[PDB]
Amino acid sequence: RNRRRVCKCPRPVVKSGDK
């Protein structure tokens, strides 16, 4: 009926940067 209201992120935080 309804799944556990857990994390629903369209891009989880990963150990990395952007530079």
Least distance from Zn ion to the Cβ atom of residue 1, Å: 22
Q: Which CB atom, from 1 or from 8, has the smaller least distance to other proteins?
A: 8
Distance CA 12, CA 9 (A): 6
**Contact call for residue 14 and other proteins (CB under 8 A):** no
Q: Tell the residue number behind the tokens 């940067």, with chain if given.
A: 17
**Contact call for residue 6 and other proteins (CB under 8 A):** yes
Which one of residues 1, 3, 8, 19 is an interface residue with other proteins (CB under 8 A)? Answer: 8
